[PDB]
Amino acid sequence: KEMPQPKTFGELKNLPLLNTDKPVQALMKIADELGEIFKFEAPGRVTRYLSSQRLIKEACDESRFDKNLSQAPKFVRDFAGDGLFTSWTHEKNWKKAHNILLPSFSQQAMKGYHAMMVDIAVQLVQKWERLNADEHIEVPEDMTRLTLDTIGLCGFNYRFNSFYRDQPHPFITSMVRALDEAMNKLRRANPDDPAYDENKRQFQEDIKVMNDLVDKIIADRKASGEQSDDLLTHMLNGKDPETGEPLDDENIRYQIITFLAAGHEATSGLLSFALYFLVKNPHELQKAAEEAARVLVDPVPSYKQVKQLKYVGMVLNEALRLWPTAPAFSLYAKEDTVLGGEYPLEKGDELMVLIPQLHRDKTIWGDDVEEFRPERFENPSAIPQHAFKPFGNGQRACIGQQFALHEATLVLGMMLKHFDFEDHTNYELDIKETLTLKPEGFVVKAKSKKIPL
Template structure:
């Protein structure tokens, strides 16, 4: 039986700043190293005396399940980082809480049933076909797969949200999201936060980006509502605008905008990361790539995949799941404890900031032998049945699990199948430097040579 200790171990860091330098320079490496040296619950301190932050890292599968699922009511999205995301991107499904969240979830849930999501497959295929055509027409011999999949995923989610109103929204999001994400990150980790309305250069740049992003969403929403139900549009924005119930009412214009921004943010970055790294990993592992292509050729025989093909492409799904294990789009998930609780034998005090980290748990040696090795066979049904539920949680878990996880898998499998039908890949950059922002971020290129399969 585990004993309870009030002393949670952790790195000492420096007397003046604790672990602040290590966390700023390489938070993912620091978390991974700390689990190895100190165990599954680790206490981090960062910042100068008087402004020092304390964060508890929970790295076991059982601990992640406790934070996200079994005791989720005790771990809220009340930390400084989520507040910054909330103020920049709105109070949508990603950041809302309590009755706001429950109301939003009830209104949105019918739009994300498996049957409804499967209907988005054609829109995904249109955007994948456009990417493949651009590669063919340009005669390119290599691509940065992360950059290319980011554009693909953004265009796909924008098409599903806005129908044909894709180009302007994509251009604005491509330019604005990174700048606003950097601003959120800087403020989220800063021990001293100047008010947003102070006219500092950083605040003024962020305000301009924020205004432009809101303006394009508001314009599209207003035009769609003005066209009315008679337009016949069945994109997600129209369905969101029409979502209504006797209990929850409907979304007003500002609420619609906030949902749209969350879907654009979460809906493209997760899929782009999974797809980009799946291609890069296949480009480094020719045997696994050959096996994936053989499955695609056997099942599809050259035709465009549909939602009905997903179950017939199990190895492709395993490739994507292994890519999400090694490169989870949300590598760190934050919460704040309401009351004191015991996790893995250690007491987490009331009010403490807590993180769970797919980046670390997905590499936990108790569940993943040789954890850095790429092995899609870790995700056969038999292998998955033998592991704890929260040994792998790229979509979060519990009542706040990502509502779009089936959409992400549908889009990823369809895109990967279509791409592997036409091209093989050979990695040029064998290692990709990474950092953790709102999502996992590549700090260098992930280039692959394109090898046309036809002719």
């Protein structure tokens, strides 16, 4: 076919379509209107947005397509360097670091991070137990406090002490502002305007704040010789089985900045959406709370108890199906190739997988795609290959997936064990877009079940 394309803006082509606070949500509406594929042009560039399982299962063939770094990740590369997320597959440091790090991210490795994840989860539950009668919880704010502190603790045994603050640790402040600079740089008139030189000055300082802290922690760890249960230990001790080389100190720094920058926000938004869906769906909240109570029988949850929260696991997947918090990923064609038997591609052509649309493909999931039904995930095996990709694809898939889901299942499990929730404001979903998705303004009241930690 000749591909559908959304409205244009003279020489700017489709570009001003992404000049909005909600670009992915804009793209979903365009996908609904145009179908499983549309072209998108900007000055100097072109990509094609894929929304069907039919086409995306082809895009996910690693023999034909590789990971593309799109403009946002290209700018995040300014501070995360050749860390795993912002490396190209063909860069030596990508495969090196992937080989070294994969065993530290396995489901088995979650046993060793568990105690540290509990440490922060306990701080979350204690915070809520200590709220007064007419106070409420700011959900994405508390989730992001928890996930930042959890990754800091497991990543490099550093305590950001986010539950002790209204203004985050200076590293967090600089990171979130660096992520913001990378995102705002996408929408800029003439990016070289002298009104942005402050933004530039600020970005360079934020990079410095981040490298100085992480470089110093690596330095102190090497000097102390201490062996902890964190990823920094694993990285200073590890050797690539392939090259036989260890990561160098710079690369280790970039990995740590990556884990923090890439991991915190999608995990925090997953938890937020999942609590949003349960408060809007009381029969499913009861099924999840009933499991938490039947399963988490000890003052603090064990790793094996977390693995047993099946229904919580299914809630988390259904939240990821509706609102995958890292909503898109980009590929390039390794060679000329014909997509779907219909769309000829040239070597280097880019594709964008629009994950929220994939997950609403009625031919896969049925007609009820907007409904929240954890039971869709009751059996792992019934879901067709490439139909559910909130963690992307293949060897460039999320190395943090077992970590995110262990973290999310543990904390959602404890939250449902410890409190009844009330959607006291009848909150209207408002999805804010940064690098990730979250429900902005989502607030609840919790009433303690008065169960000891």
